[model samples]
Target: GADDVVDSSKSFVMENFSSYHGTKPGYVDSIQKGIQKPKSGNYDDDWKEFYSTDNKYDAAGYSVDNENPLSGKAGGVVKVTYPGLTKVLALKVDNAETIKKELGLSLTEPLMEQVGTEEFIKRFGDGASRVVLSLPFAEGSSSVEYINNWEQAKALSVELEINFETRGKRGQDAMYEYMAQACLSCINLDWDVIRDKTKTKIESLKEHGPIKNKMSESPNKTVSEEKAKQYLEEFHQTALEHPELSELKTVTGTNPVFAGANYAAWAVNVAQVIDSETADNLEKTTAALSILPGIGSVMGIADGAVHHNTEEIVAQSIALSSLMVAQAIPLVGELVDIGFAAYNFVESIINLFQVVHNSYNRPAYSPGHKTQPFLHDGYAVSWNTVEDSIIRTGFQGESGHDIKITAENTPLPIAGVLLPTIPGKLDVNKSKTHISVNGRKIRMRCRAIDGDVTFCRPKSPVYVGNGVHANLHVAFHRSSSEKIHSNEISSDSIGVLGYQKTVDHTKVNSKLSLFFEIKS
Candidate 1:
């Protein structure tokens, strides 16, 4: 009787769970069992089982037709006709003759051969040209491989994190030291000139106090004009004794014009410090003054007496000085008195810091060593629409190996402005091509030549529509007969041969008929 009661209670709980979840709890058990089963080694089958669930696709805003779902092998080509609804978009391949006949287009002799050979001649002299021409269609196996497991990928991710952190800290330390140097340079300026400029600037600013009151607003409450002047005098007297203060009067004497402008430039910072609400106490006000380039060099030394961290106080001074410089010239012409040359000098320092910041913040590793490796199949061909007019065809392989051919109508101007390509023409000069193996980029030698046949043809039946067919012929050669991994392939230059044609008025359709070979 006790066992039967327990069973009844279990049934009641199951009934409640079923109503809330809209399915019986047994379904969850079945899914768990299916997940626990060994994966079929087939990439397509395993991928479909894990990712092709209707609920998963629906949640991600994607749809797959029953007739043509995601199916591809690990080292084989896969095609995706509709890219808008899928994650990967594949290029449609067709026979060169069939495409020409169906689209009512003419055939031309391959210019890629001529262009590729000529490029070889220019790059490696006449000797290499003969070798390239003789072995135009050399046979070799495809170079593609996938990562073994998730553990390897995770390890790579951890290594990447460490590399980023180490590089980032190094760059930051260098930047801080550079900042200290820049602050010291500011302190080396004639303090007498700076003090005189600061007094005049404050008087002029106060005359227009109502109109520019917002400019000097500080969180620390305003200091009286007399008190502000006294604070600056006291800061100057204390700063004179610091060993680091330069006796050279280079800023004011050698370049009087530049010196005057620079003094006026940072004088605004002086006024702000005086009016700043934070300047309630003389010690606090002088400390604020020390970090500023022209005035604060010695102020940190003064604050160091109490804080016992002269370096920290000096660094703090630089931060405030840089911030003030940035605010003074939020845009060109805002502060007309600031000399163009002086502003350029400050701007250069800021730009250098930015360059270091960006360099260290980025991953200090090769693209081939990524965590997620199985994003695309080997020898996968895809198409992407870029900039409304350009269409790019991409050939991808495992581990960041790829070739991209971008076709555009018009060429970019000398200034590198983006101009739309011609509606019905695709010039070889306008095409942008890129190739990489194992994340190492390869530069291709290219030239334009007259071909016997048209470079591109419109789609069949819809000849005037936004579709066109083209061809790609890529060649690779190994430097030596070394038995190395595909990832280690090295050559002076990879020969890329391609032709492009802009098919439509608004949308350019770039299709590829792939024919590639690698010589080992």
Candidate 2:
């Protein structure tokens, strides 16, 4: 019986694709599963949709076997696909100092000099932007992969941000709004209804599609193609009545198509593209899950909500959005306290873009000359010197590390620094970390060290900056000996003295966490 069943299953799979025998490696299977659509030129029949179309399925690990990467076509594995399916929203704001430094222009020398939004936008508006972020799994090894595999619709380059904080997870409604705005591939917001129905049709084919497995009741709460075959057909008929959707893309041929009201469309496709030759991939399917929306019962509450009524789901989403937006105001407010500013001038709009262009072009950068491209995960972004050309930024995940900068003979500052501000300034807040010295009372508040307030170094090679501090790579030295060798910090080794030897420090590190007095 066991031998017979195995042979039968294999036969069934091949039989389904009997018609297109003379195609590429997996062409027939790709078409049967709706993974790949018919394309004219250079289109690979073997390559299917990288993400899934199931609105209910995030479709990360659901391939052939568990350990197998994206090749399986069924049964998704899991990892880092947390707070699943909810969207991340971002509002990018550039720091005045970053732009000023890069462009060789500073209306305000020290951020402490007080710059306003008009001035800020004038200074950095060309470079300022933001985007909603999501995680590509936990560590971001696949973050680049997600962008690489992103479909024609959701395409993004290596420089995009996927702001995952689990902060906006509760705002499904806001996420809805964000998706509506960000995604154009599913057709405009008004066409979302059609996209929804299209998603239902494609998702219905899973399990029984290439895998030939019956729907596991627990895996998907909705009707399965086998049991709910009629409903599935109804959905299919519905798609036939309407034309297939087109891929999404930015005007300049950069990012991917706005994949959808149906993330499953792109998500499942991402799953199918993995290296699935063994149990290793199946077992390691967690990576697939990490980069996708996820699948089945474990995909999380959002996906789980499918069985529930859409109206109720939407209503709850709206309520949550309100709550989240309310909280976000304060969070954003706290971010604004940094002395840095952004400015949008009636003039220089083109020049602003030139600055943006120059940064990405890497014009004359030294080893430490920080610079990066704009955009992360398709969202627009402004680079800050604080981040060696910031890759990940505002409202993003832990990988969203930034850089810190100090120049020799800097106009001022024996103190701290400020970061670029997004949105409006509400309160002064700085990120602080723990700093231990040669073993006195540990040097204080190093975490994302705050700007202004300065402390006497008790440790040599005293680590500075959030990234360096975490690794103890930064250092401090006697002001007299703090040389400008080769135009950068020369004293690799650090020097520290008692409190008396300390000079007055100002502001903060542009990092650290600090609560400031908001204008009342």
- For candidate 1, give the lDDT of residue 454: 19
TM-scores of all predicted structures: 0.18, 0.17
* Model 2 lDDT tens row, 34-92: 22334544243222223221111122212223333222223221111211122121112
Off by over 4 Å in 2: 1-192, 196-247, 251-416, 419-459, 464-520
lDDT of each: 0.25, 0.24
Instruction: Report the poorest 10 consecutive residues by lDDT, candidate 2.
Output: 13-22
lDDT tens digits by residue: candidate 1, 365-432: 22112211111111122222112111222221111123233323332111011111211222222223
Q: With candidate 1 superimposed using the best TM-score fit, by how many Å does residue 140's alpha carbon deviate from the native?
A: 31
On lDDT, the candidate that comes out on top is 1
**Candidate 1 RMSD to the correct structure:** 26.8
